């Protein structure tokens, strides 16, 4: 049944995986409005598609910067994976294309902003609020992992809240399809599993560890391992010690001890019963997984929405022109994009 669903899902995913959509729009088809976020090798902007008037979020990557940061293959992974997946809590890729200078991915615009912004402002979420979001991640990971995908960058900065108050997972820049083990040091310091820090060779269990960090941060207001410098964060992560706020329920602590488990033969998500050890944990006893998947559960809050194109749920960023060189850069490197 779940197995039945995942089978058809894999069948759909593979058709697209083997025959990726490519070159499905052009820069001039979009009016650029405002930067929604920005950092290494690119930015994401709110745009309007001229022929339809729809708004989208367009990620713009500078090919030369991608090459210097050694992110060529990770970028190809991101686009090939995003064009192939389909799940209610995964942001959709509607168009992609490239020009002499940049790569572009045009995604649904999610006007409610990042969970990060809301969580930092409110301080922490109640357990029922955190459980509502955590449930959607659990199902999204059940989906991605069944397609042999590892996501590798779970954090509130990468989770958007939509107009119904549900989560859309974005930022697939480190996602990878791999059977068996992989070794790349990537992720965000507060969310790395011990085996990534220790250069061990790792698999989807790192996403389940990251879910434990995320649930902790949502419910506490701060992550379980924090310091002023990454090295001190890593020393805390590998120590085997974790402390919980005194307001955490006993069921919540027990789930987190099993997720934030350094020993892989004991980490929930990674045992004989797979994701079911998580879905059937007492902390989730009230969660109706089907109702969540169907978006039938009432959300903890609906973001304020002041009209189409409104960005007030996003921070302001310095704006920079989109320059397109008269010469093609890095054509060979990104030919399959």
């Amino acid at each position: 049944s779940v197995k039945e669903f995942l089978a058809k899902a894999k069948e759909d995913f593979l058709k697209k995986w083997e025959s990726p959509a490519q070159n499905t729009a052009h820069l001039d088809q979009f009016e650029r409005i405002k930067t929604l976020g920005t950092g290494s090798f690119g930015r994401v902007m709110l745009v309007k598609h001229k022929e339809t008037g729809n708004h989208y979020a367009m990620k713009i990557l500078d090919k030369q910067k991608v090459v210097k940061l050694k992110q060529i293959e990770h970028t190809l992974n991101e686009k090939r994976i995003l064009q192939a997946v389909n799940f209610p809590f995964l942001v959709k890729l509607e168009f992609s294309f490239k020009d002499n200078s940049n790569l572009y991915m045009v995604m649904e615009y999610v006007p409610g902003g990042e969970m990060f912004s809301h969580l930092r402002r409110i301080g922490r979420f109640s357990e029922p609020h955190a459980r509502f979001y955590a449930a959607q991640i659990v199902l999204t990971f059940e989906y991605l992992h069944s397609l042999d995908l590892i996501y590798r960058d779970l954090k509130p900065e990468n989770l958007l809240i939509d107009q119904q108050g549900y989560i859309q997972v974005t930022d697939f820049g480190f996602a990878k399809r791999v059977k068996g083990r992989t070794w790349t040091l990537c992720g965000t310091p507060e969310y790395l599993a011990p085996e990534i820090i220790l250069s061990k060779g790792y698999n989807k269990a790192v996403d389940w560890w990251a879910l434990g960090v995320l649930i902790y941060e949502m419910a506490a207001g701060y992550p379980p391992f924090f310091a002023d410098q990454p090295i001190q964060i890593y020393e805390k992560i590998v120590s085997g010690k974790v402390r919980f706020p005194s307001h955490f329920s006993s069921d919540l602590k027990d789930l987190l001890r099993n997720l934030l488990q350094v020993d892989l033969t004991k980490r929930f998500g990674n045992l004989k019963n797979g994701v079911n050890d998580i879905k059937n944990h007492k902390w989730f006893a009230t969660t109706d997984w089907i109702a969540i998947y169907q978006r039938k559960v009432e959300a903890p809050f609906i973001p304020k929405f002041k009209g189409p194109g409104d960005t007030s749920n996003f921070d302001d960023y310095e704006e920079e022109e989109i320059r397109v060189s008269i010469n093609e850069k890095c054509g060979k490197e990104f030919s399959e994009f």
């Binding site: 950092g39 900065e157 207001g221």
Partner: peptide
Amino acid sequence: TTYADFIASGRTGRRNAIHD
């Protein structure tokens, strides 16, 4: 309090990914 220690730390803004 742990919360006060977090709020006074330099890592309450958006966190960058790492890579080699």
